[PDB]
Design a binder for this molecule. Structure first.
Ligand code: HEA
Ligand SMILES: CCCCC/C=C\C/C=C/C/C=C/C/C=C\CCCC(=O)O[C@H](COC(=O)CCCCCCCCCCCCCCCCC)COP(=O)(O)OCCN
Ligand SMILES: CCCCCC/C=C/CCCCCCCCCC(=O)O[C@H](COC(=O)CCCCCCCCCCCCCCC)COP(=O)(O)OC[C@@H](O)CO
Ligand SMILES: CCCCCC/C=C/CCCCCCCCCC(=O)O[C@H](COC(=O)CCCCCCCCCCCCCCC)COP(=O)(O)OC[C@@H](O)CO
Ligand SMILES: CCCCCCCCCCO[C@@H]1O[C@H](CO)[C@@H](O[C@H]2O[C@H](CO)[C@@H](O)[C@H](O)[C@H]2O)[C@H](O)[C@H]1O
Ligand code: CUA
Ligand SMILES: [Cu+2]
Ligand SMILES: [Mg+2]
Ligand code: NA
Ligand SMILES: [Zn+2]
Lengths: 144, 58, 49, 514, 84, 105, 98, 259, 227, 43, 79, 73, 46
């Protein structure tokens, strides 16, 4: 069949699990041999071949349940593309760090941090849980 | 004064393809053109005032 | 017969994941980003006075 | 032709279209502002080297996302396009006044940008509290321009609110009761009521601020016996209804989208959804001082404002569960719009739940003006409002355009966004519990790790924004025209084809009484 | 709603005109009278340079920047006091 | 509401209508799949015979596909239903989807 | 103490307002101001739906108090049935054309 | 052809001129407050008048002359108007709130009393009372006008309406005179500020209301209104009552209670 | 103060803040319960092929989902309200201190006896001594006696500021023309930091608060020497 | 939803181009300003 | 009567967070009391309590501003 | 040779929901309880243990000797 | 009357995909660029 855009006010064919018998047949114009097949259908169905039963089905319906519910590999593309563009974002970050950001403050130098840590332990920062609680003041080392 | 409403109904219902804001004739057109000219020229001037205010001065 | 996801899915999956992991790991560890992690169990305190 | 159609429109579809273009463009401005915030915070130290400029950037970020991106797209954009189509109305009640609601936004937005270019800009916070916003601490035109920008946005929304309420009450088929209207229509009606009641109060409060700045009144200036806290009342009296105004239409779109892609004919508990939105609307007017728990109000006032605010979870819980109940037993189609909807439901809940934490004035003492507030409201806005906008945009894009999006590309876009907004905003809860203030251009070193991660996450969302522009170009460049749409028997807006003709419902629908 | 009147069975414009001339306008004459015999003029208040009054945090943007809009020299002092 | 047995009977009746038309057939099946059940064989049987009176072989096959679809993960429902309908399928010459190869993608 | 001088709608109403006023006077509803009344909606007693073209959108509120309306295009020709409750509707021509 | 009763409006330039005129007015005010220039402002005011003139003329053309206002259209205009009055009410609420906040908890800098030290309030029993009686009286005469109109009485409609307009104008002259005589100004702390801004906005609404009434008088002279169809007159009368009620609240709160 | 990679609140230094910490735990427990419940349910709705797309009846299930949350809110509000009243309760302070916000620094006044006041400015980064904290140190700390109830009065001489110290549970806006009261009580001596918490301009980020908590006797000697 | 095949198919090569131009229109003017921040900071 | 003054005690007339009126009232009370104890050549030490309380509660700049205004004849409170 | 037994055919969706909704409470409650036991009780216990043998003067003294205070050397 | 149908109910042309792309790119790119130029302008003003 050929569905057209001005047909929007006319009943249309859908394949949905939940609306199994759509408003129109998939195929509405019949060849000479298809008309003769519709004629055969009026007689006993034991007389139809497999091929003829199948063609009857395909005139009425576009996809079978098995076809309409098939799963796909789309997930792989979606996830792979997502990861690619996430990885691409890292290039912008490398760029920014290289050409935009200047140096960080000197308070992040290793020696500053060691000292600053000691003072923090001297003033018992978060002595109950957070920080100083993790320092062994007797053995003078981080609690194991 | 007298009731001239019927005449106006006749003039504004006239099937000449003109929109309501021009249906009264030449005077509509002038007033329309004047309004437009002031708005567009006023807008241009307010842009000019913005760009002028956007820099520091004396 | 095969759609775009059938032909390309696996290639797009493998190579997207691989590119993503390499570049992030590189960015996170080789360009000098200061993360400032917990000094706890990492830093040896030094006299400051 | 072009001018008559696009500058002189009196058509609800074309004016909804102008709104969507405008809101898209504003959204790029707001995005750029948000990335400047995160670039400045991305490493310790100073990037811009001028904290007045950082304050201006933060302030403009907010006005732009709120008044120029969210409201024009949800209410102006989807409102005009969908409301007349969902109720069989030939257009809005006041089609010419409607066009003025739209045309006031560009000049309003011009004034906002002008303010950031004259003098040193308006570095005030979007709350614009005096004495900071006053003519000493912010001398010169910048704050006045911001005030005039808000006036015009206010007037635009007030006339829009009048048009929506009128259209929705008066232009339904005679047989159709308000209890037969779709939830999106209800959501817009209710939002229009909040707007009509709250915006004039703001208009009053910022008019007072204007006269304090230029006419020597002392409404908020202690030296004449005025009171800076009076401004906070007036502002938040508007401001709390404003935040429901930003979410309600989102609620309404979510109910359509969830219903549609579950294969259902109607949402679960329709009247309970109407009740919940009405209740939210009303309770949203009596809670505003939870924005003021640190200003020195009496304890009984704070006990009251804590309690009334908590009650809001109840009608909101009803809508959340009703969406989940609409999914139950559905024939689920995993379209991209449905993925936006589901991520909305979960992330909105998360932002809602940290609102309940803040509602406690006890704990709010410690959390107020910290990054916990900022984590809280970007959850409901950037994964609530934005997610609803994205889910609405992909769902009805074929109705507006006649063309389809590439589904796979739309699903890539959702996955990237979902990662980036979480990576941006999740760590900001830790910043707030640990004590980092809002509105700071630099922070004590302890706060570095979370700030670093958060700025990284904001680049991921940038990449999604760029990909979204390309996904839109790809749709118009390929031109896959719509043939068929499912479930039109319960979704009237599709019934006139894609896109519907310029005039729809010239002959109205026929609805029997019985 | 009552206070000494009837009207309800046959009325309209007639009733409202009755109320306009029989009641509303005479009240206006009574209040005008009551106003007219309190006029004359009033003792200009003494000047005290109170800092909660005569606010100037920015000049007005007309005249000399220091006169309010309906400035009355007789009863409105400037920040420095009444004008000569 | 109404009972299991009442429900089954009304449906069996619905499809037994001698002069059922094509619209009614569809409406009945499109309504029935809305429910939280796989319909009883007696109901399917009646629906199949309705297809026969309307000379519509393709719908009979589609109805069987839908019985299978509604059972979802319950693999045992469909073979049991086919077992119970086997006399009707033989009487009327209705081939299963599996027999037509329509269950394969 | 009462003159006239104020025109009436009957003298002075024009355009569509006049058409509505006149049709109402003759009990007609060409501009769809009133809700039509259901018939029994069977095959033999269908809801008659007036239209000036060949198709019109019908909304069916199948049962009193449904919140959901069922919408479909009704075309000229045999009666069609609401797909939800099966009530019959048939399109009928003109009138509203003067 | 349509077979609904609603109005599809011809494409129109006035929304855009209106918006532009808003941009020019607020740009103008800005330029006025910070750069002592009034040109932009005058231009914005001019184009705003022209816009309103033409937009409202067109509405009259669409209704009195073209017949577009069916009962359905007219029903929407009622809703729109009532809604618009409601938003004006919430706007006045903001200034009442400012007044109550300042006067119920007067600060030390004011002497800790209300009215503030050094402020000499007007006597509520003098001109403000006359003003009250003027607006209440005009609420009576406008109701008379309404009923004359409904009964088809042209002469008395015009006479009631003229009396209403005259009372409005008198209120406005009396108020201008009161402003001139007042011993306090807008720069007198929060007492001058709440007083002049609240009564000033009201004064502005009386002017707009009086204008709307004058437009109705002319339309009446010109026979636009019928005894059943005169929504423009009804809207002007709602607006008039609202201006009236707001005055009663001002009088009770600020002049009387707050004195 | 905060330490790197901190997840939660700073360790409590006052009874009030410790009370907030446990109340936070109670609330967060509930937050976890509800969010996990919702997430399980969403995924339960999406993981089956079984369908039911006809009308479902709403008014039985709505009870549960109205009553449950009201019960939950009540379990949150009761203790929330107990704490709020407590943060307010009748004090008997031994000392009154005033703090006044300015752009951009704080001043302090201790005027129960002598008229002592001083200004308190951030140490610029280039003036820091090793082990000193970027953006947190001031030249003049607020020295106070540990283990005593102190009345803090907060105000401003210019724009809005807000005086905060997270680890004591303190945050009170500073408003010109107004005097806001809070009460401060430390269980421990030491140094406790906070930051201006209402945007006050360009240098909002740079006007920190350092409390120095010491034994009374040290407090008195320090006062006299600060005159 | 069902749709007609594209009236004007955008091929993979054309997508690459659309994507590249889109990304650059965002990244360049921003990179240019940010790259020159210090030059501006030396005002 | 009440020395060993440490600080202003709780005052149930001002039980909330906003203490502005407490500073203010006690300032007025002091200067009222001082005025009266000067008119009858009396001793100003009976006023001392008000002075201590407002010294403890009021910011130096308020007090100092109010003193200037009292001198200048522009203080707006009734003393 | 042998027929299949008649399986359950009604309320399959509802039956799935009956079961799982119990699990959903278990898990929900489970997370809440873990939070209660592993964090909240741990917290109360940390504070109770810290203050039971705490000495504010000893603490002060160590801080004084470390040189941290401006007021006390 | 106005053109109706896909690609006609919008104020820009989609008749040529390369011209569309240039347009979108000016449109979206100008909004994105604007804040960076406003920050620049404020830095250079001093
Ligand atoms: C869409 C925007 C939006 C929304 C919808 C909300 C929703 C809520 N918010 Fe929020 N909020 C803002 C945007 C919003 N917020 C913004 C912008 C600010 C900052 C202003 C500024 O300073 O700039 C703010 C700040 C703000 C504060 C100020 C705190 C401070 O500054 O110190 C508070 C305090 O009470 C608050 C609370 C709430 C509450 C209780 C809700 C509730 O409505 C949430 C209700 C929802 C749920 C509770 C989840 C769903 C419910 C269930 C699943 C049922 C079961 C649940 C329970 C039993 C609890 N928010
Ligand atoms: C019976 C009179 C009716 C009022 C009309 C009078 C003319 C001026 C126009 C104002 C109308 C608009 C209201 C603005 C409010 C202020 C004016 C208050 C009324 C008034 O006129 O106040 C006067 C001073 O005002 C002054 O500065 C006058 C300065 C005028 C500058 C106008 C300020 C512009 C403000 C724009 C505000 C934006 C409004 C927003 C719209 C809402 C959008 C949602 C009082 O005079 P005075 O000398 O201080 O004391 C008397 C001394 N014997
Ligand atoms: C019909 C509507 C429903 C009605 C619900 C009723 C509930 C509302 C309460 C009404 C107001 C009662 C006011 C009397 C109570 C006295 C409180 C008071 O007087 O509060 C004062 C300010 O109040 C003030 O402006 C009060 C100002 C009032 C503003 C209130 C905001 C509500 C506005 C809503 C707008 C409604 C719109 C509809 C209009 C038609 C401030 O506090 P103080 O005491 O100075 O502090 C003293 C400290 O120094 C010492 O402790
Ligand atoms: C610094 C100084 C600046 C101020 C300058 C002064 C400003 C002037 C404004 C004066 C207001 C005039 C409004 C005139 C509107 C006339 C149009 C009209 O009245 O149109 C009518 C419809 O009503 C309609 O649209 C209703 C239209 C209602 C509009 C009323 C709204 C006025 C609001 C004005 C702005 C308020 C600003 C407030 C600031 C806070 C026409 O229908 P009918 O009457 O039934 O006629 C038809 C019959 O003939 C049929 O037989
Ligand atoms: C928040 C959004 C953040 C987005 C991150 C931006 C991503 C990077 C885009 C590249 O931007 C370009 O980078 C060049 C450098 O790599 C700059 O050239 C500069 O440097 C070049 C090499 O050093 C010289 O050739 C040029 O003349 C000189 O302008 C150029 O101006 C700039 O447009
Ligand atoms: Cu002071 Cu922020
Ligand atoms: Cu709020
Ligand atoms: Mg704050
Ligand atoms: Na920074
Ligand atoms: Zn029906």
């Amino acid at each position: 069949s050929v569905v057209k855009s001005e047909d929007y006010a006319l009943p249309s064919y859908v394949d949905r699990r939940d609306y199994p018998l759509p408003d129109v047949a998939h195929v509405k114009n019949l060849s000479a041999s298809q008309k003769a097949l519709k004629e055969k259908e009026k007689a006993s169905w034991s007389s139809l071949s497999i091929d003829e039963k199948v063609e009857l089905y395909r005139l009425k319906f576009k996809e079978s349940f098995a076809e309409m519910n098939r799963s796909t590999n789309e997930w792989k593309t979606v996830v792979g593309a997502a990861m690619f563009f996430i990885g691409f974002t890292a290039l912008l970050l490398i760029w920014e760090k290289h050409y935009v950001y200047g140096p960080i403050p000197h308070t992040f130098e290793e020696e500053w941090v060691a000292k600053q840590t000691k003072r923090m332990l001297d003033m018992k920062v978060a002595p109950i849980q957070g920080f100083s609680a993790k320092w062994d003041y007797d053995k003078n080392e981080w609690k194991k | 004064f007298e009731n001239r409403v019927a005449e106006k109904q006749k003039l504004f219902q006239e099937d000449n393809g003109l929109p309501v804001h021009l249906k009264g004739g030449a005077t509509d057109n002038i007033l329309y053109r004047v309004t437009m000219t002031l708005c567009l020229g006023g807008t241009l001037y307010s842009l000019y005032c913005l760009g002028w205010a956007s820099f520091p001065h004396k | 017969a095969p759609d775009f996801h059938d032909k390309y899915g696996n290639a797009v999956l493998a190579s997207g994941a691989t590119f993503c992991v390499a570049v992030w790991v590189y960015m996170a560890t080789q360009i000098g980003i200061e993360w400032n992690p917990s000094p706890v169990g990492r830093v040896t305190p030094k006299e400051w006075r | 032709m072009f001018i008559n159609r696009w500058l002189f429109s009196t058509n609800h579809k074309d004016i909804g279209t102008l709104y969507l273009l405008f809101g898209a463009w504003a959204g790029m401005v707001g995005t750029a502002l948000s990335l400047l915030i995160r670039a400045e915070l991305g490493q310790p130290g100073t990037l811009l080297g001028d904290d007045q400029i950082y304050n201006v950037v933060v302030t403009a970020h907010a006005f732009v996302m709120i008044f120029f991106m969210v409201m024009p797209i949800m209410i102006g954009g989807f409102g005009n396009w969908l409301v007349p189509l969902m109720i069989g109305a030939p257009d809005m009640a006041f089609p010419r006044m409607n066009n003025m609601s739209f045309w006031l936004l560009p000049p309003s937005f011009l004034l906002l940008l002008a303010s950031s270019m004259v003098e040193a800009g308006a570095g005030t916070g979007w709350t614009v509290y005096p004495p900071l916003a006053g003519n000493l601490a912010h001398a010169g035109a910048s704050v006045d321009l911001t005030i005039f920008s808000l006036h015009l946005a206010g007037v635009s929304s007030i006339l829009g609110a009048i048009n929506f309420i009128t259209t929705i009450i008066n232009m339904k088929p005679p047989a159709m009761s308000q209890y037969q209207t779709p939830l999106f229509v209800w959501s817009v009606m209710i939002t229009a009521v909040l707007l009509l009641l709250s915006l004039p109060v703001l208009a009053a409060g910022i008019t007072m601020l204007l006269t304090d700045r230029n006419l020597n009144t002392t409404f908020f200036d202690p030296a004449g016996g005025g009171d800076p806290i009076l401004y906070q009342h007036l502002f938040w009296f508007f401001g709390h209804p404003e935040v429901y105004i930003l979410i309600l239409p989102g609620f309404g779109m979510i109910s359509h989208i969830v219903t549609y892609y579950s294969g259902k004919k109607e949402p679960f508990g329709y009247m309970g959804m109407v009740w919940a939105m009405m209740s939210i609307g009303f309770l949203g007017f009596i809670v505003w001082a939870h924005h003021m728990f640190t200003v020195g109000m009496d304890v009984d006032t704070r006990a009251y404002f804590t309690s009334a605010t908590m009650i809001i979870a109840i009608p909101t819980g009803v809508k959340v569960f009703s969406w989940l109940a609409t999914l139950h037993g559905g024939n689920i189609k995993w379209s991209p719009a449905m993925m936006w909807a589901l991520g909305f439901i979960f992330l909105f809940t998360v932002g809602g739940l940290t609102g309940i934490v803040l509602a406690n004035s006890s704990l709010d003492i410690v959390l107020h003006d910290t990054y916990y507030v900022v984590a809280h409201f970007h959850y409901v806005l950037s994964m609530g409002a934005v997610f609803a906008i994205m889910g609405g945009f992909v769902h009805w894009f074929p109705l507006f355009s006649g063309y389809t999006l590439n589904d796979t590309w739309a699903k890539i876009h959702f996955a990237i966004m979902f990662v980036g907004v979480n990576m941006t905003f999740f760590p900001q809860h830790f910043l707030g519990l640990s004590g980092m203030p809002r509105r700071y251009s630099d922070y004590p070193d302890a706060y570095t790790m979370w700030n670093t991660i958060s700025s990284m996450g904001s680049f991921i969302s940038l990449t999604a924004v760029m990909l979204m522009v390309f996904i839109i170009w790809e749709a118009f460049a390929s031109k896959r025209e719509v043939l068929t749409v499912d479930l039109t028997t319960t979704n009237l807006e599709w019934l006139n084809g894609c896109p519907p003709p310029y005039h729809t419902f010239e002959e109205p629908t026929y609805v029997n009484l019985k | 709603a009552s206070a000494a009147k009837g009207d309800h069975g046959g009325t309209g414009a007639r009733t409202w005109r009755f109320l306009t001339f029989g009641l509303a306008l005479p009240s206006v004459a009574l209040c005008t009278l009551n106003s007219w015999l309190h006029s004359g003029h009033r003792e200009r208040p003494a000047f005290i340079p109170y800092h909660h009054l005569r606010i100037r945090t920015k000049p007005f943007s007309w005249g000399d920047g220091n006169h309010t809009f309906f400035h009355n020299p007789r009863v409105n002092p400037l920040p420095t006091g009444y004008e000569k | 509401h109404e009972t299991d047995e009442e429900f089954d009977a009304r449906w069996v009746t619905y499809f037994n209508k001698p002069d059922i038309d094509a619209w009614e057939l569809r409406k009945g099946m499109n309504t029935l799949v809305g429910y939280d059940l796989v319909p009883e064989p007696k109901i399917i049987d009646a629906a199949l015979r309705a297809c026969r009176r309307l000379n519509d072989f393709a719908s009979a096959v589609r109805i069987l596909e839908v019985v299978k679809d509604k059972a979802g993960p319950h693999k045992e429902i469909y073979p049991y239903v086919i077992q119970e309908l086997r006399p009707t399928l033989n009487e009327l010459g209705i081939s299963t989807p599996e027999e037509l190869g329509l269950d394969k993608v | 103490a009462s003159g006239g001088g104020v025109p009436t709608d009957e003298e002075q109403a024009t355009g569509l307002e006049r058409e509505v006023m006149l049709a109402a006077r003759k009990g007609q509803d060409p501009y769809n101001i009133l809700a039509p009344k259901a018939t029994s909606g069977t095959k033999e007693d269908p809801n008659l739906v007036p239209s000036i073209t060949n198709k019109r959108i019908v909304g069916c509120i199948c049962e009193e108090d449904n919140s959901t309306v069922i919408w479909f295009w009704l075309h000229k020709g045999e009666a069609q049935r609401c797909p939800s409750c099966g009530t019959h509707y048939k399109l009928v021509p003109h009138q509203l054309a003067h | 052809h349509q077979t609904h009763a609603y109005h599809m409006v011809n494409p129109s330039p006035w929304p855009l001129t209106g918006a532009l005129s808003a941009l020019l007015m607020t740009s103008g005010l800005t330029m006025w407050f910070h750069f002592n220039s009034m040109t932009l402002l005058m231009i914005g005011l001019t184009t705003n008048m022209l816009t309103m003139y033409q937009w409202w003329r067109d509405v009259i053309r669409e209704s009195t002359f073209q017949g577009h206002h069916t009962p359905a259209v007219q029903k929407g205009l009622r809703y729109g108007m009532i809604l618009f009055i409601i938003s004006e009410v919430l706007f006045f609420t903001g200034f009442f709130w400012a007044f109550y906040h300042s006067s119920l908890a007067p600060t030390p800098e004011l002497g800790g009393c209300w009215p503030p030290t050094g402020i000499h309030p007007l006597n509520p029993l003098e001109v403000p009372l006359l003003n009250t009686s003027v607006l209440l009286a005009s609420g009576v005469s406008i109701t008379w006008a309404h009923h004359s109109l409904m009964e088809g009485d042209r002469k008395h409609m015009l006479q009631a309406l003229f009396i209403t307009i005259t009372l409005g104008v008198y209120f406005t002259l009396l108020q201008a005179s009161e402003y001139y005589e007042a011993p306090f100004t807008i720069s007198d702390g929060v007492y001058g500020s709440t007083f002049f801004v609240a009564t000033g906005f009201h004064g502005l609404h009386v002017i707009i209301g009086s204008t709307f009434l004058i437009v109705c008088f002319f339309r009446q002279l010109k026979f636009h209104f019928t005894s059943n169809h005169h929504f423009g007159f009804e809207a002007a009368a709602w607006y008039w009552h609202f201006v009236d009620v707001v005055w009663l609240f001002l009088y009770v709160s600020i002049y009387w209670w707050g004195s | 103060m905060a330490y790197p990679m901190q997840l939660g609140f700073q360790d409590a230094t006052s009874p009030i803040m410790e009370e907030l910490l446990h109340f936070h735990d109670h609330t967060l427990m509930i937050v976890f319960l509800i969010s996990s419940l919702v997430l399980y349910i969403i995924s339960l709705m999406l993981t089956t092929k079984l369908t039911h797309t006809s009308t479902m009846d709403a008014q039985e299930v709505e009870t549960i989902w109205t009553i449950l949350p009201a019960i939950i809110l009540i379990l949150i509000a009761l203790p929330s309200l107990r704490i709020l009243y407590m943060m307010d309760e009748i004090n008997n302070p031994s000392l009154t201190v005033k703090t006044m916000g300015h752009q951009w620094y704080w001043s302090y006044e201790y005027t129960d006896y002598e008229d002592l006041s001083f200004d308190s400015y951030m140490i610029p980064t280039s003036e820091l001594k090793p082990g000193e904290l970027r953006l947190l140190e001031v030249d003049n700390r607020v020295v106070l006696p540990m283990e005593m109830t102190i009345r803090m009065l907060v105000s401003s001489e210019d724009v809005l500021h807000s005086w905060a110290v997270p680890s004591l549970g303190l945050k009170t806006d500073a408003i010109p023309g107004r005097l806001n009261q809070t009460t401060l009580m430390s269980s421990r001596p030491g140094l406790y930091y906070g930051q201006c918490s209402e945007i006050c301009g360009s240098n909002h980020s740079f006007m920190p608060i350092v409390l120095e908590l010491v034994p009374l006797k040290y407090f008195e000697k320090w006062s006299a020497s600060m005159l | 939803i069902t749709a007609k095949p594209a009236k004007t198919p955008t091929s993979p090569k054309e997508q690459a181009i659309g994507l590249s131009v889109t990304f650059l229109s965002f990244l360049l003017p921003a990179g240019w300003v940010l790259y020159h921040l210090d030059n501006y900071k030396k005002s | 009567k009440i020395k060993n003054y440490q600080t202003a005690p709780f005052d149930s007339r001002f039980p909330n967070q906003n203490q502005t009126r407490n500073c203010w009232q006690n300032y007025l009370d002091f200067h009222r009391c001082e005025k009266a104890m000067t008119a009858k050549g009396g001793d100003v030490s009976v006023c001392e309590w008000y002075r201590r309380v407002y010294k403890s509660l009021c910011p130096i700049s308020w007090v100092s501003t109010w003193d200037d205004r009292r001198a200048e004849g522009t203080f707006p409170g009734k003393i | 040779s042998t027929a299949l037994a008649k399986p359950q055919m009604r309320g399959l969706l509802a039956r799935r929901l009956r079961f799982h909704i119990v699990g959903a409470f278990m898990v929900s409650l489970g997370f809440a309880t873990f939070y209660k036991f592993a964090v909240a009780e741990k917290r109360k216990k940390a504070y109770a243990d810290f203050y039971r043998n705490y000495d504010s003067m000893k603490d002060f003294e160590e801080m004084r000797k470390a040189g941290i205070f401006q007021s006390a050397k | 009357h106005y053109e109706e149908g896909p690609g006609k109910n919008i104020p820009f042309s989609v008749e040529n995909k390369w011209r569309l792309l240039a347009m979108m790119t000016l449109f979206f790119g100008s909004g994105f660029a604007a804040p960076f130029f406003i920050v620049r302008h404020q830095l250079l003003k001093k």
